[PDB]
């Protein structure tokens, strides 16, 4: 009756758009496709690679619940964007938690700087930070035992584009993209960027707060022309890339991957 | 009457003459009960390209609510005056009293 | 002749023939060479190789001036564009600036009519 109308606004009230409410129960597993049902119009074709943790093998059997993401509806048939990004929000929440007590503590282990800041990895994910953040002083973890255990003390974060440089060792110590496009500029600043869509000439890795990068086909590997970028890297994956070129005018930052 | 916005560029050797010129311009405006809402000596400035062989010039901004006859007169004066290299009298909807972004 | 350390190389690259002209920084030409002059005619002189050899010839010609530094100004569309500069480099000048100086009108004169072939 209005039973159904009320039930509709009820079901509106008991779901939201992003990957927030851990609701999809894994109702069939087959390599290489997981699939859930979070109270959406259809079931997700999940990769297996959004769900294996830190050494390669699966972690969740039938009935298990992770939220995914949304705001994109129907490409022909199907429903979602991946739950792994979901996870990013959780990471953001832990990073935010720092603010409360002015100190987020986990483990951060940063061996080296792709682009001037040691890389820190938290749980499954690994992030890149600006060069200062790795060390509190001028200590430098190059003399430290390799891939050492500390935590991360945050030095610097870019707040829009996601780059976070964190503080290893020293426990005792405690319009918008395009005007100032000189931060990752200078010749070869390495970046960690998720690829988006590979347009048979390109790969379109673009992460640093509303920009566009290409890594088109010529570098990508150490073979030139026979490569076909879909075979050689991925879809949706955070990779090794650096700038090699910026035009701040005809917004074409032309990144590379052969480095 | 009509809110104009004027920017004229003086030859850099006549930079010491500029204030007098400005005063004169103001006076004329005042004469016909015309208001002058902002007035900004930008000073000596490097040109993006060398107009009439010279590389710097002295820019003056000036916003005026005046009758069009006086504007015309001003334009005429500018054209004949050899100190002022370029001018650009340019209509505007409102008074726009707040300062320019290059002054700030 | 007065020796000069730094100068310009003007590379006039047409569809039919490349012309390389080495000059001082002020404008006064020191030497020049062409693909047509280098012993290439018609099909041959409208090629990168021809351009390169012209460039080489030009370089040879301005040996007595003792030019070390060189800025290149590349004009027009042609094969003799990249090749010529490479040749120049090989010949052994420190290439300082590489400028493009193609005359692009801002819609000015009417071009000649389109060929019917």
């Amino acid at each position: 009756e209005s039973f159904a109308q009320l039930f509709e606004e009820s079901l509106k009230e008991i779901e939201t758009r992003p990957g927030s409410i851990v609701r999809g129960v894994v109702v069939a597993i087959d390599k290489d496709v997981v699939l859930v049902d979070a109270g959406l119009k259809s079931e997700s074709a999940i990769p297996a690679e959004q769900f294996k943790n830190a050494q390669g093998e699966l972690e969740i059997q039938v009935g298990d619940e992770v939220d995914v993401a949304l705001d994109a509806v129907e490409d022909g048939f199907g429903e979602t964007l991946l739950s792994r990004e979901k996870a990013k929000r959780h990471e953001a929440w832990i990073t935010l938690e720092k603010a409360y007590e002015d100190a987020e503590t986990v483990t951060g282990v940063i061996n080296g700087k792709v682009k001037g800041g040691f890389t820190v990895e938290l749980n499954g994910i690994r992030a890149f930070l600006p060069g200062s953040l790795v060390d509190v002083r001028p200590v430098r973890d190059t003399l430290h035992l390799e891939g050492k255990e500390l935590e991360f003390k945050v030095i610097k974060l870019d707040q829009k584009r996601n780059n976070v440089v964190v503080s290893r060792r020293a426990v005792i110590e405690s319009e918008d993209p395009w005007v100032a496009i000189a931060k990752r500029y200078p010749e070869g600043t390495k970046l960690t960027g998720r690829v988006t869509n590979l347009t048979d000439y390109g790969c379109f890795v673009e992460i640093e707060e509303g920009v566009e990068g290409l890594v088109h086909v010529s570098e990508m590997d150490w073979t030139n022309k026979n490569i076909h970028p879909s075979k050689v890297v991925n879809v949706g994956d955070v990779v090794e890339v650096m700038v090699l070129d910026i035009d701040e005018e005809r917004r074409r930052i032309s990144l590379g991957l052969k480095q | 009457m009509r809110h104009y916005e004027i920017v004229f560029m003086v030859h850099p050797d006549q930079s010491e003459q500029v204030p007098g010129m400005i005063e004169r311009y103001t006076a004329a405006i005042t004469g016909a009960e015309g208001k002058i809402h902002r007035l900004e000596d930008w000073g000596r400035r490097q040109l993006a390209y060398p107009i009439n062989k010279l590389h710097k010039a002295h820019y003056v901004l000036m916003n005026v609510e005046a009758p069009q006859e006086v504007i015309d007169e001003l334009e005429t004066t500018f054209r004949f005056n050899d100190a002022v290299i370029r001018s650009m009298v340019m209509r505007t909807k409102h008074a726009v009293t707040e300062a320019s972004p290059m002054v700030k | 002749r007065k020796q000069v350390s730094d100068g310009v190389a003007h590379i006039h690259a047409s569809f039919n023939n490349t012309i390389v002209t080495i000059t001082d920084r002020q404008g006064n030409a020191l030497g020049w060479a062409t693909a047509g002059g280098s012993g290439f005619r018609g099909s041959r002189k409208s090629t990168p190789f021809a351009a390169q050899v012209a460039a080489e010839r030009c370089a040879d010609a301005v040996k007595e001036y003792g030019i070390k530094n060189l800025e290149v100004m590349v004009k027009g569309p042609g094969p003799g564009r990249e090749s010529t500069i490479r040749a120049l480099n090989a010949a052994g000048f420190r290439i300082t600036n590489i400028t493009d100086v193609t005359p692009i009108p801002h819609n000015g004169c009417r071009p000649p009519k389109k060929r019917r072939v």
Binding site: E175, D176, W178, V179, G210, D247, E248, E249, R250, R251, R252 | V7, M9, L47, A48, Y49, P50, I51, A57, Y59, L61, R86, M88, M90, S100, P101, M102 | T99, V101, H106
Partner: protein, 66 residues
């Protein structure tokens, strides 16, 4: 992803040279609305501003000219 919609500007200013400089080429040319992602209404205004600037020698018409 237009800047002027977000800022919410009433009119683009030719005097605001820095802003203009983001939308102009290394060669001096005005950058397309595909690349910048500027809104159409604003784009025209921006272009006009640039033109004005060029007249006032605030921006250059081109890189080569002198």
């Amino acid at each position: 992803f237009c800047r002027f919609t977000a800022e919410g500007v009433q009119e683009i200013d030719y005097k605001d040279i820095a802003t203009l400089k983001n939308y102009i080429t290394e060669s001096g040319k005005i950058v397309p609305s595909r690349i910048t992602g500027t809104r159409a209404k604003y784009q025209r205004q921006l272009a006009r501003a640039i033109k004005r600037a060029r007249y006032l020698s605030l921006l250059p018409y081109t890189d080569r000219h002198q």
